[PDB]
């Protein structure tokens, strides 16, 4: 009696199955409990997290209400245990004031012997505990928002007892072992389990207690400050083992470890207060702040004028000059860093994450892998920056040509027993775009990339050499490759439709939990060449090096909250592990969220039933169920995946019934998984497979006649090809050889445009060939050299 209108189930559903048109449940709850007024919903895009970030301040007003429900649940659970009651706790039996009712599934067995079943109860709540800042009260002295903040000791770095205290106060009846320090976990499943709790618990500890942990050590009697461990928001405290004090001299390897270690740079730097950003920072390494600009593109007037004389760039034409190198201002680099403000602590539904990851693993169950030695590592890009401070001396060649293979293996072995918290450097990029936004690259250091290849390269090379699988990296579009990739995804789908989607702010909002999941999946090949402790330290290093590393910008060191790094060895692959995880999650939710009794097909009805019962029960992995669910997705939701870019050929007859994910499922999943709103305006749907995917690998697809048969060809946007022709990166002004090579490559990409019905698109190819013949005569390319590129050999 005297219950609220809505239940915890409605709040969780409204937040996890979010849809801007049908958001009345959420809007009413937010107004009812004074999170915001009604006028709040008249703000353009009030529900987004990227625009109008204010929504986080609004959801946070539910945080006290959410912790009150968690606390009442624990009190309820104690009462039913003492009463001898056995039963299941659900969200629709608890109202929004946290009161429990309607205990129909509860039975009595014996006084003092009851037990709550809370696996779906807490797992369903978990994603909204970080969204609504449920533990914000715990930052206050009495766990009371009306009182002062805890005067935490700056030198405290462990917080093991504090995490256990939170665990046993809010999740007291979560009957699964929690290990605050993930170093103590038995397998990878136990790391995601524990890390998910650490994400929530770590938000009430001060920001200065996280990151590298340091000690004073001596060499030849001279003191140094070095890292001897690291405190991870997700993994807890990891200590180093190979810590040697009172050494006499340092080895080359020790110099690399210390030079890369911010303990030497930050502890010795200036204190920095940077008001241009909302991100946490540690130290300035200078006395003078550096600013960085980007110059305009180098205009190739001869190409442009040549094209104008052929009818290009005329008013009213369908092909415009849209792609340019835009100049940047002084405070660009920092405004780029500041987009890391969108990476929010995100807790996952662990019962679902631990299922989805098994399905994700099935998708990579055809690739080879394992650890290779230093003399088995292939590095072609040796002109790549070695990162800060290594880049003050040279490029990767300098370190690869200095260290013996035995030393490269020794550095690798070090990272299997310790953690090296490296520094990467961010820089502005001079590149062609249709937009004036800043673009950057990540100068990931040599002390990371040199050992990441030994751990991951065998797998990355196996993935890149495999054709016909779902994750397609390194597969050429040429010689029928585009066509073969499309036939591979189309497969035997019964009623095929094509879909794609967008990942709003991916390289910045991707949470550390999914970044850990992806590195754990890629590390699953290390079974016959890596023990458990070694697999943990390698995870700790990947996390210290690319999720929570120190990033130099300008003249100072900033801390990265999360996201991806464009300079790392695995990003192109880790992003595909992620894309599959989100797509699988959307399909798991698409099926579980529908009405199981409205399904005409008994098979699917039984699949939905068993799917629920393989997530919130039956914790042990049911490999037969996973194989079955996986096979279902392969048949009705066929994916072709590249780093943050996917095409899905799906059975629309099932998607129509909610048995297969659709774009609305991706929108909901992204909203709570990456804290971003995905506009439908950036997502395409195509019903006619005569035409290919609207866009994949930034290219359009059309079916054309070739060989008295038909093939699919990719094609570029003509405005990018002409823009690329017209503006250069200032390196072809001295050597016509380079000018010809870039024009020939553009001419090849433009080739398929001659098959296009729009003559103005076809003309771009012909323009390029006449220009190239002119360049070859001045220094030959013919239409046969470009035609052979799409003819299978």
């Amino acid at each position: 009696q005297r219950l609220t209108k809505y239940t915890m189930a409605d709040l969780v559903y409204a937040l996890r199955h979010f849809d801007e048109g049908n958001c009345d449940t959420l809007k009413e709850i937010l107004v009812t409990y004074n999170c915001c007024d009604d006028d709040y919903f008249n703000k353009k895009d009030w529900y987004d997290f990227v625009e109008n970030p204010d929504i986080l301040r609004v959801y946070a007003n539910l945080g006290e209400r959410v912790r009150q429900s968690l606390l009442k649940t624990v009190q309820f659970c104690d009462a039913m245990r003492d009463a001898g009651i056995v039963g299941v706790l659900t969200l629709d039996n608890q109202d929004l004031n946290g009161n429990w009712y309607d205990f129909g599934d509860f039975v009595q067995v014996a006084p003092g012997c009851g037990v709550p079943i809370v696996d779906s109860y807490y797992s369903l709540l978990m994603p909204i505990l970080t969204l609504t800042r449920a533990l914000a009260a715990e930052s206050h002295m009495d766990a009371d928002l009306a009182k002062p903040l805890i005067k935490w000791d700056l030198l405290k770095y462990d917080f093991t007892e504090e995490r256990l205290c939170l665990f046993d106060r809010y999740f007291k009846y979560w009957d699964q072992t929690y290990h605050p320090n993930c170093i103590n976990c038995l397998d990878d499943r136990c790391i995601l389990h524990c890390a998910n709790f650490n994400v929530l618990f770590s938000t009430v500890f001060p920001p200065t207690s996280f990151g590298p942990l340091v000690r004073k050590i001596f060499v030849d009697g001279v003191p140094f400050v070095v890292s001897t461990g690291y405190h991870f928001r997700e993994l807890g405290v990891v200590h180093n083992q190979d810590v040697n004090l009172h050494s006499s001299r340092l080895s080359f390897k020790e110099l690399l470890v210390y030079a890369a270690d911010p303990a030497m740079h930050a502890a010795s730097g200036n204190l920095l207060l940077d008001k241009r950003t909302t991100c946490f920072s540690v130290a300035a390494l200078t006395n003078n702040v550096a600013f960085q600009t980007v110059k305009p593109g180098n205009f190739n007037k001869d190409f442009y004028d040549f094209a104008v004389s052929k009818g290009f760039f005329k008013e009213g034409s369908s092909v415009e000059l849209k792609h340019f190198f835009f100049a940047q201002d002084g405070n660009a680099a920092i405004s780029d860093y500041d987009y890391y403000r969108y990476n929010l602590p995100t807790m996952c539904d662990i019962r679902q994450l631990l299922f989805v990851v098994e399905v994700v693993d099935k998708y990579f169950d055809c690739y080879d892998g394992g650890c290779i030695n230093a003399n088995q590592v292939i590095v072609n890009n040796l002109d790549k920056s070695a990162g800060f401070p290594f880049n003050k001396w040279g490029k990767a060649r300098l370190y690869y040509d200095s260290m013996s293979y035995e030393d490269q293996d020794a550095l690798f072995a070090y990272t299997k027993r310790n953690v090296i918290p490296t520094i990467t450097q961010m820089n502005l990029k001079y590149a062609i775009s249709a937009k004036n936004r800043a673009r950057t690259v990540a100068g990931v250091s040599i002390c990371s990339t040199m050992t990441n290849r030994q751990f991951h390269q065998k797998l990355l090379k196996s993935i890149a050499a495999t054709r016909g699988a779902t994750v397609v990296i390194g597969t050429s579009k040429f010689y029928g490759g585009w066509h073969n990739m499309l036939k591979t995804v189309y497969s035997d789908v019964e009623t095929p439709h094509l879909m794609g989607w967008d990942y709003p702010k991916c390289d910045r909002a991707m949470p550390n939990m999914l970044r850990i999941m992806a590195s754990l999946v890629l590390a699953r090949k290390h079974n016959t060449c890596c023990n458990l402790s070694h697999r943990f330290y390698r995870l700790a290093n990947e996390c210290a090096q690319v999720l929570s590393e120190m990033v130099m910008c300008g003249g100072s060191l900033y801390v990265k909250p999360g996201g991806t790094s464009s300079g790392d060895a695995t990003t192109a692959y880790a992003n595909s592990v992620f894309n599959i995880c989100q797509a699988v999650t959307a399909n798991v939710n698409a099926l579980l969220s529908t009405d199981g009794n409205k399904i005409a097909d008994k098979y699917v009805r039984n699949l939905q039933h068993r799917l629920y019962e393989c997530l919130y029960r039956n914790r042990d992995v049911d490999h037969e169920f996973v194989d079955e669910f996986y096979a279902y997705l392969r048949k009705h939701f066929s994916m072709m995946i590249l780093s943050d870019d996917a095409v899905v050929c799906y059975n629309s007859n099932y998607a129509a019934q909610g048995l297969v994910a659709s774009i609305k499922n991706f929108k909901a999943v992204l909203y709570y998984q990456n804290n971003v709103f995905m506009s439908e305006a950036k997502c395409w749907t195509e019903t006619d497979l005569t035409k290919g995917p609207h866009e994949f690998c930034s290219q359009h697809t059309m079916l054309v006649k070739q060989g008295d048969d038909y093939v699919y060809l990719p094609y570029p946007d003509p405005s990018r090809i002409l823009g690329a022709g017209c503006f250069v990166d200032d390196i072809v002004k001295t050597d016509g050889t380079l000018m010809i090579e870039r024009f020939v490559s553009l001419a090849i990409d433009a080739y398929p445009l001659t098959k296009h019905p729009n003559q103005e698109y076809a003309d771009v190819f012909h323009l390029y060939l006449q220009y190239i013949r002119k360049l070859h005569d001045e220094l030959m390319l013919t239409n046969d050299n470009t035609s052979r590129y799409w003819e299978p050999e």
Binding site: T208, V214, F224, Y258, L273, K275
Partner: protein, 115 residues
């Protein structure tokens, strides 16, 4: 072996230069006050850096961060030694106000020492 030798020398030179700047009383105090000799790296600059750099994007931020000769940050009183603008020119404190705000190369960088 010239590549290795040049790297070895450069690295040793860099690390030792930093050690000369790093070894001080404040550092010994933060380590000695640790329960086991271990402290977070992120609290060392707050304890051992004698100099603070403040980067301020506009006047309102300046007024609420570094108004006048001194200010408080990271539980310490700081004394401003100099203000340098984004063009690396010297700006006097008497020149930073609302009326002359449009004429300064913002952000300004304020250098201050522990009082």
């Amino acid at each position: 072996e010239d590549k290795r030798a040049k790297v070895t020398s450069a690295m040793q030179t860099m690390l030792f230069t930093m050690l000369r700047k790093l070894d001080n009383d404040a550092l010994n105090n933060i380590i000695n006050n640790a329960r086991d000799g271990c402290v977070p790296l992120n609290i060392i600059p707050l304890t051992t850096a004698a100099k603070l750099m403040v980067v301020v994007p506009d006047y309102g931020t300046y007024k609420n961060t570094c108004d006048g000769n001194t200010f408080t940050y990271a539980s310490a009183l700081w004394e401003i030694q100099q203000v340098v603008d984004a063009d690396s020119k010297i700006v006097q404190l008497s020149e930073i106000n609302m009326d002359n705000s449009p004429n300064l190369a913002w952000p300004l960088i304020v250098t201050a020492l522990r009082a």
